[PDB]
Write a protein that binds this ligand. Sequence first.
Ligand code: G3P
Ligand code: CA
Ligand code: NA
Length: 263
Amino acid sequence: NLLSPDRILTVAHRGASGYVPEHTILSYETAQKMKADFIELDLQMTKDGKLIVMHDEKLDRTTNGMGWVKDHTLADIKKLDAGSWFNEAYPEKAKPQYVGLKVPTLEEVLDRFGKHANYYIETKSPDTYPGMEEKLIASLQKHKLLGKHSKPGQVIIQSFSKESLVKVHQLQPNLPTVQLLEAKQMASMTDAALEEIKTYAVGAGPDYKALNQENVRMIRSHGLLLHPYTVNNEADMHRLLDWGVTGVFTNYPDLFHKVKKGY
Ligand SMILES: O=P(O)(O)OC[C@H](O)CO
Ligand SMILES: [Ca+2]
Ligand code: NA
């Protein structure tokens, strides 16, 4: 069971993004081959209302385009190069085949992997994107990833926005959510706050730098899954697993897969 506290989950942060440009089909394919349990998506929305996968609200960092995603049509965004930026930023990891990779839609990612992947999907800035949760759920429903014979945990919805997750939970009670937390939030965490999270979410996803043995124990004592982000070096993977987290977001899913076998 994907949602079992006894199972350690490898969540490939924006795919195998330590090796391949984030949020490209190729990044997700690479994560799959590296035995990731989940491929992780960040959602934005185009001017014509299409959900696409991109971390930033703006095109500037990971494409040769400029401006807010929501000011551009999907057709115009599909003209962009979403791979070359990676070759430039990380020359030592550059590959010729990264040139010309495209921004995928949510629909394209679900179409690519179907039920062969598990999806960890974040609603970014959902208050700025009317209808984001409904469109997301509609896409999941039509790709047969929802329903009550669906595999529990095949999709997890995550967000920094509590509002977004409460909305998802109200619309789809059996769709597991995970509340994301910044270091500043996690540092002042209370039992009351965790009990509140537990009413709509099955787990918490904090900045791992805010974690210690005591508050890992605290989170787990509430029966919450615990998936800290973003864990990229092996020593920290060991430390967190030793403390008792139940998975991580990582840019190096192959490395975490190896580490977790010892726990
Ligand atoms: O990488 P960010 O900025 O989306 O941070 C949150 C983690 O990815 C967990 O979704
Ligand atoms: Ca994310
Ligand atoms: Na750019």
